[PDB]
Amino acid sequence: GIDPFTWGFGGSSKEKPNYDYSADKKLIEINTRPISTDNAKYWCFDKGNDLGCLSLEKLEALESKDLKKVVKFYEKTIPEYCYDKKFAPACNIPAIDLIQQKLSYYVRNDIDNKTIKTFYSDYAKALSESKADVKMLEYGCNELKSAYICRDLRDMYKYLGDKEKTKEYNDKMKNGDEKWNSVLYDYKHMRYIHGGYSSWWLLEKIK
């Protein structure tokens, strides 16, 4: 048919990630300082929270100094938790760790004329180009009803300038499942369990 959708109708739905591992690689190569797993273990073991389990897996991957374990975390473990286990706080982790936190680093370090002025537009543009991530967000919002995942799409469409889609995801935010309504799961909040575990941040602490 004329719509190219029809040319791929019924085909493989698989979306391959194109993630930038350059900061995780760099951290593994140069970091000499122990990274504390105590907080992640507290959330995984003491509190029983799967977001802490994911944080601990990320940190253990870095400890291993095997980049392949970092790749496994983002490409296998994350989708296994987001999709297969219906754990909505996994769904935005690659976006945060490998896009949001990368662009943040460019703002902090005055790289390539990136500023707070361009950041929100820049992040929306970069996230919208990462189809693997967009599809995990759509799942975490539309299927799992996580208002924080809905908010990720709301923000993306807002700074793309798509008013209809911004409204759509704003409305979906108001209808979230209470199981996901904790600042533990809000990447913008200090209480975020997974906060500070991007290598784009960890590189700042090498000191």
Do residues 194 and 54 touch, judged by C-beta distance below 8 A? Answer: yes
Q: Which residue has the tokens 């970092």?
A: 70
Distance CA 168, CA 72 (A): 33
**Two structure tokens written together for 61:** 């991957």
- The approach used to solve this structure was X-ray
Which stretches of 65-189 are DSSP H helices? Answer: 67-72, 78-79, 93-95, 101-108, 116-129, 131-138, 147-160, 163-173
Instruction: Write out the two tokens for 126.
Output: 């970069």
Tokens read off for 153: 């799409």
What gap in Å lies between CA 191 and CA 185, rounded to an integer? 8
How far is the CA of 182 from the CAs of 61, 78, 133, 196, in angstroms? 27, 20, 22, 18
User: Helices H, strands E: what count in the chain?
Assistant: 12, 0
Resolution in A: 1.4
The number of angstroms, rounded, from the C-alpha of 83 to the middle of its chain's C-alpha atoms is 14
Question: Measured on CA atoms in the order 151, 188, 159, 201, is the torsion positive or negative?
Answer: negative
Cα 22 off chain centre by: 16
Which residue, 58, 69, 88, is CA-closest to 195? Answer: 58
Distance CA 22, CA 7 (A): 35
Q: What is the longest distance spanned by two Cα atoms in the chain?
A: 58
